[PDB]
Amino acid sequence: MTLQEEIIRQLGVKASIDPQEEIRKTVDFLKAYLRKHSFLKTYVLGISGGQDSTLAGKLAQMAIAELREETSDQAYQFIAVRLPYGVQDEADAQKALAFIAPDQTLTINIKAAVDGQVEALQAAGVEISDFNKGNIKARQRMISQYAIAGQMAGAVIGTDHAAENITGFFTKFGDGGADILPLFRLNKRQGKALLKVLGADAALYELADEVALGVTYQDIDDYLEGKLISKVAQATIEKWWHKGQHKRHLPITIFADFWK
């Protein structure tokens, strides 16, 4: 077994998908989770305008709408959350929301919380880089979505998928803090295929990420499909893989071995 094969098996990625089958698999999973938990009635998700939250949101909304219909229980609701830091793509978020047409939309401006946090750090003499403040924002979004879910008998949806999970390209306990992952197993192009079949405007799924990573989503996706990619791209992916292992495990106990 190569490392590539091992990654593929861990992340559950298929070389190809049937998009409609994957939509159905997802929606049925989200419905089963809701039904299993007596007190859970809502899903909560930050809608940013990016591909991942657009897709997860549409699927979650579909799950809610079907369950609501099956049960005749109107308490079943999808809660879209806008989470701008101050004056935010505002256009992209608005296209996502028209595509999803959520039962409810709330706007939580995270800027007072983030600013309060940074102020308290800088006062204690802790310098905060732009990267660091980015991670604070992602975590504050987590706090926001959990506060909403805590008050509205909800679960928080995450947008993690295989193309981000392989590179560890999320904030630990930030956008990586969620209850349920509807997109886990899909690569980036597979996510686009689902959006296309759901009827999304091509703007929602047609990069700063790739430059930051040093590798394209095309290479990442090809890798996860078992294809051969360049040596550089391969080494780059493996580096991110080994680096991000702590993000793919629970907090390290004296019994854990993955890190050694």
Long-range CB contacts (within 8 A, 24+) of 170-176 = 170/138, 170/247, 171/134, 171/135, 171/138, 171/139, 172/246, 172/247, 173/139, 173/142, 174/135, 174/138, 174/139, 174/141, 174/142, 175/46, 175/138, 175/141, 175/142, 176/247
Measured CA to CA in angstroms, residue 183 lies from 30, 113, 223 at distances of: 11, 29, 18
Q: Given candidates 153, 172, 214, 240, which one binds a second copy under the rule CB under 8 A?
A: 172
CA 233 – CA 218 distance, rounded (Å): 10
Site for a second copy contains 103 (CB under 8 A): no
Site for a second copy contains 240 (CB under 8 A): no
- Evaluated on CA atoms 105, 111, 116, 120, the torsion sign reads positive
Q: Which does 258 bind (CB under 5 to 8 A by kind): Cl ion, a second copy, none?
A: Cl ion
Q: Given candidates 128, 153, 214, 238, which one binds a second copy under the rule CB under 8 A?
A: 128
Which residues contact residue 118 at a Cβ distance below 8 angstroms, ignoring those fewer than 6 apart? Answer: 128, 133, 136
Tell me how far, at minimum, the Cβ of 202 lies from a second copy, in Å: 27
Give the 3-state secondary structure of residue 74.
Answer: coil
Tell me how far, at minimum, the Cβ of 32 lies from Cl ion, in Å: 14
Residues that bind Cl ion (CB under 5 A): 256-258
Tell me how far, at minimum, the Cβ of 66 lies from a second copy, in Å: 17
Site for a second copy contains 258 (CB under 8 A): no
Residue 78, beta-bridge partner list = 43
- The two most distant CA atoms of the chain are separated, in Å, by 56
90 is in an annotated binding site: no
192 is in an annotated binding site: no
Query: Which candidate in 6, 21, 22, 52 is catalytic?
Result: 52
52 is catalytic: yes
Question: Residue length, the chain?
Answer: 260
Site for a second copy contains 32 (CB under 8 A): yes
Query: Which candidate in 22, 160, 164, 219 is catalytic?
Result: 164
Residue whose CB is less far from a second copy, 26 or 53: 26
Q: Given candidates 66, 92, 97, 109, which one binds a second copy under the rule CB under 8 A?
A: 109
Site for a second copy contains 97 (CB under 8 A): no
206 is catalytic: no
Catalytic residue annotation: 52, 164
- Chain residues binding a second copy by CB under 8 A are 12, 25-26, 29, 32-33, 36, 106-117, 119-121, 123-129, 131-132, 135-136, 139-140, 142-144, 146-148, 150-152, 158, 160, 172-173, 176-182, 184-185, 246, 248-255, 259-260
